[PDB]
Amino acid sequence: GSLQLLEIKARGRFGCVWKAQLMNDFVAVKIFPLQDKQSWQSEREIFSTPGMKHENLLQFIAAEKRGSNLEVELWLITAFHDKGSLTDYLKGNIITWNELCHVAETMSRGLSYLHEDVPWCRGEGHKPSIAHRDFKSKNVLLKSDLTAVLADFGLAVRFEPGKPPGDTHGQVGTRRYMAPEVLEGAINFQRDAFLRIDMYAMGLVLWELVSRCKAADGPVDEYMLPFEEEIGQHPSLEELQEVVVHKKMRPTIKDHWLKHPGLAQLCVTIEECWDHDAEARLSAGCVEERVSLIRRS
């Protein structure tokens, strides 16, 4: 190769992302140990679906089966986004209202577009809807200009009559971002149903953005993960089930945030996104449109 590995950037779930050098540029190389072949094959099949060339989805370069028995590593080469992920960005920066609006609209744009069935993409073919299945601020990367890029499709599932998937399990996502349906183990293998599970998680990602924005007044608090403040960064299926399902709670929307006309309307939108009733949640496309028209306020 002229592929030259440089440094570890992210420790992913089933794989590990290296900054790497290719030709005169950088590329991200995710390395799967050989027991995670089926995450590498899942993830490469998603990237290989028609119409996945899109400004707000991570871009695919190559998948390499580096060898034969017991030596085999599985490499997946995508574009490298130096600015990194949204969660670490939020960890170290407080963002402007224009930046929030831009990351919110491009992030819902890339999600609505993942979610979208496109009868035909020229030279390529049918793009079915795709549910992410692990949507979170770790999995939203950021361009130089803060444009959102969705990443990490190792759990994504296509809704394509006739091309079925492999083993698809019920509770596969990061626990903190799990819709109550999911926590309770109750999930129809239907497109609308999975989409709405993604939308509950984008709701919490929106919250995270709002929580580190300069909100024309009060001080801005240090970044926390959804529910890190209520239970832990981690604690289990059982505590989330209390706080999220039984007691009905969500990350606090601060009173003083409501005195900004933009943030007031974005929080209304968040609350519809993370509604207990799955059927009451907005689609990604309706969030993209909302965000656009709030910017315009």
Ligand SMILES: Nc1ncnc2[nH]cnc12
């Ligand atoms: N985790 C990551 N951080 C930065 N750039 C990436 N490009 C692909 N994955 C990436």
